[PDB]
Ligand binder design. Structure first.
Ligand SMILES: CCCCCCCCCCCCCCCC(=O)OC[C@H](O)COP(=O)(O)OCCN
Ligand SMILES: CCCCCCCCCCCCCC(=O)O
Ligand SMILES: CCCCCCCCCCCCCC(=O)O
Ligand SMILES: CCCCCCCCCCCCCC(=O)O
Ligand SMILES: CCCCCCCCCCCCCC(=O)O
Ligand SMILES: CCCCCCCCCCCCCC(=O)O
Length: 582
């Protein structure tokens, strides 16, 4: 429902409601000063209370969309600030909302948000928590207009845990900054993931999306029957599709509905969901989405019977090609939660290709009798990659490992700028750090998931400023070859090595007052300019120059002077190196 606003107020709570109204408005009106959206949020909140007291009350019968757009159209400066979005107001609902939806700016071109010093922040926090927290909720929201709002609220609450804990600890910066650094990471990864969820849907289409989802849901709910996994992916895809159009209210209802359906049918889905079905609306769906894998049914048969030995394989396949392949993929996925989703799609795509050849022939059982042999190599290639890389990592350590990567890729694609090489190799390094600590079981899902963050940003940066056809190839290619494409880059032996330049390999005393990290980005940048300039540098020729530079600093920051050792012994490093790397 009779009143939809009353119903969200009741269901969300007051604080949560005030929060999501702020985020809603911050994401359309991305230029009205904070101390001004607050006026709005209180006005919308005051109205909500009246509708809650009496659901007959004026304007309460209206739809969320209508109230929301009606409110957008009240702001005095709309036409001067936002220009042709004010043009949307001269329409009726539903068109008016489609019009508003289509005029959000993804790059609102604001100044970078600058983290104040820890003590400034903590003083601000204590002196007024509500205001400190909302001002920041406003600053993220208008920079990330497409970030599903309930997710922002969840980070919001984690920023508030980090402050309360750390702003009364012995050493606050030691407490606070890693927490803030992990939040930046996670915040950014999630933002990356959503834009890649949609992009994939638009380029590669719905069937590919469903394939991905069947794999993922079958690893997560491996006691569910194929019929229920399939029902869940049908609705799972409908919601992503709706959540990509970009309309918060519609997207949120579908998510609500799905969590609703999942909790009613727990018995038929998974035993690991009782914890999250007792949670309140706002959180239910976020939770289910991060739910841990249910233990798999004990002692299932192999697939051989249904997918190889059976005599009904071409008949079943021909009758409904995509339900069959989807069942193969369901029976595979639930058996192996230790596989990355993309491995499964590669396996499933291979089983597909042989059936098209082998069903088209006239001894089909004979032709495709050996199809499981082909899975072995594809399964083992990711496994080894993880093995060689996690045995390298634990014997070099994060930083040195980051540096093993830096020279590997600079030699492979030496036309990528030095900053992009530094950032990808540093993050790749961190993915190594993060998934090697896992047992072998949960490693591959781990790495798939962090690589796709690290490699998508690669493409996005390279998208606008491209300097390699091979990188471009790996980026536009299929989502099941993004990774192996890159893994196939060889050394660029056409490379014309960069001319020398004194400036880059000059260093000063400030480097000693640089922070652990800051110093590393510096050291690592020189390392890329060194490989660009001497690509044919044997590892050991480079190992020894890195050890010359290593002494050149320490035995020079620990010396009784100066600049000068920096100028005059740096003079003697450049000369020596040029000679030994020749
Ligand atoms: C569902 C996409 C990937 C999730 C991986 C595993 C799925 C597990 C199955 C539980 C179903 C999920 C329950 C509700 C549906 C659900 O959580 O997602 C619905 C759409 O992804 C909407 O995306 P958006 O709202 O922008 O994402 C929020 C996080 N950034
Ligand atoms: C009206 C502003 C939007 C608030 C409703 C979002 C709740 C989603 C769960
Ligand atoms: C429940 C039916 C959903 C569709 C399942 C069909 C699976 C298609 C197998 C081929 C894999 C292609 C991989 C891809 O497109 O990235
Ligand atoms: C800056 C371009 C360098 C390319 C980086 C290699 C891509 C990661 C390989 C996959 C593991
Ligand atoms: C650079 C991080 C250290 C170890 C991880 C290397 C990644 C190799 C496996 C990629 C996992 C995704 C599965 C796949 O592409 O099939
Ligand atoms: C041809 C001029 C050579 C001088 C430039 C040397 C650049 C090497 C960067 C050192 C990275 C090592 C990091 C470390 O081990 O702490």
């Amino acid at each position: 429902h009779k009143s939809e606003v009353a119903h969200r107020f009741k269901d969300l709570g007051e604080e949560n409601f005030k929060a999501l109204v702020l985020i809603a408005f911050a994401q359309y009106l991305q230029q009205c000063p904070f101390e001004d959206h607050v006026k709005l949020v209180n006005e919308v909140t005051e109205f909500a209370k009246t509708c809650v007291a009496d659901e007959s009350a004026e304007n309460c019968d209206k739809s969320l969309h209508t109230l929301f757009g009606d409110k957008l159209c009240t702001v005095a400066t709309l036409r001067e600030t936002y220009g042709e979005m004010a043009d949307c107001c001269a329409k009726q609902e539903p068109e008016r909302n489609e019009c508003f939806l289509q005029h959000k700016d993804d790059n609102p071109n604001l100044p970078r948000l600058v983290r104040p010093e820890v003590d400034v922040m903590c003083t601000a926090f204590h002196d007024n928590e509500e205001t400190f927290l909302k001002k920041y909720l406003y600053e993220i929201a208008r920079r990330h207009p497409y970030f599903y709002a309930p997710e922002l609220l969840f980070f919001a609450k984690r920023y508030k845990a980090a402050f309360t804990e750390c702003c009364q600890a012995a050493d606050k910066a030691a407490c606070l900054l890693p927490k803030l650094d992990e939040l930046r990471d996670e915040g950014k990864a999630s933002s990356a993931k959503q834009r890649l969820k949609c992009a994939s849907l638009q380029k590669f289409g719905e069937r590919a999306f469903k394939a991905w989802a069947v794999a993922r849901l079958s690893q997560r709910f491996p006691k569910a029957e194929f019929a229920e996994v399939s029902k869940l992916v049908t609705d799972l895809t409908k919601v992503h599709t709706e959540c990509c159009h970009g309309d918060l209210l519609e997207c949120a209802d579908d998510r609500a509905d799905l969590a609703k359906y999942i909790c009613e049918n727990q018995d038929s889905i998974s035993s690991k969901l009782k914890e999250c079905c007792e949670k309140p609306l706002l959180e239910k769906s976020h939770c289910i989405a991060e739910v841990e894998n249910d233990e798999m049914p004990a002692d299932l048969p192999s697939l051989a019977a249904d997918f190889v030995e059976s005599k009904d394989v071409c008949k079943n396949y021909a009758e409904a090609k995509d339900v069959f392949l989807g069942m193969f993929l369901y029976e595979y996925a639930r058996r192996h939660p230790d596989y990355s989703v993309v491995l499964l799609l590669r396996l499933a795509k291979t089983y597909e290709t042989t059936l098209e050849k082998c069903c088209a022939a006239a001894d089909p059982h004979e032709c495709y009798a050996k199809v499981f042999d082909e899975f072995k190599p594809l399964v083992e290639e990711p496994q080894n990659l993880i093995k060689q890389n996690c045995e390298l990592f634990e014997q070099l350590g994060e930083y040195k490992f980051q540096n093993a990567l830096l020279v590997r890729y600079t030699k492979k694609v030496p036309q990528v700028s030095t900053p992009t090489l530094v950032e990808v190799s540093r993050n790749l390094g961190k993915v190594g750090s993060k998934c090697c600590k896992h047992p072998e079981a949960k490693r591959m899902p781990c790495a798939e998931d962090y690589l796709s963050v690290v490699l998508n940003q690669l493409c996005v940066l390279h998208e606008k400023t491209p300097v390699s056809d091979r990188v471009t190839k790996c980026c536009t290619e299929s989502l099941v070859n993004r990774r192996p494409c890159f893994s196939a880059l060889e050394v660029d032996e056409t490379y014309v090595p960069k001319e020398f330049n004194a400036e880059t390999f000059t260093f000063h005393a400030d480097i000693c007052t640089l922070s652990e990290k800051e110093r590393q980005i510096k050291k690592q940048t020189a390392l890329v300019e060194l490989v660009k300039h001497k690509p044919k540098a044997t590892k050991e020729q480079l190992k020894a120059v890195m050890d010359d530079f290593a002494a050149f600093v320490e035995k020079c920051c620990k010396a009784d002077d100066k600049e000068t050792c920096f100028a005059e012994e740096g003079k003697k490093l450049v000369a020596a190196s040029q000679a030994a790397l020749g």
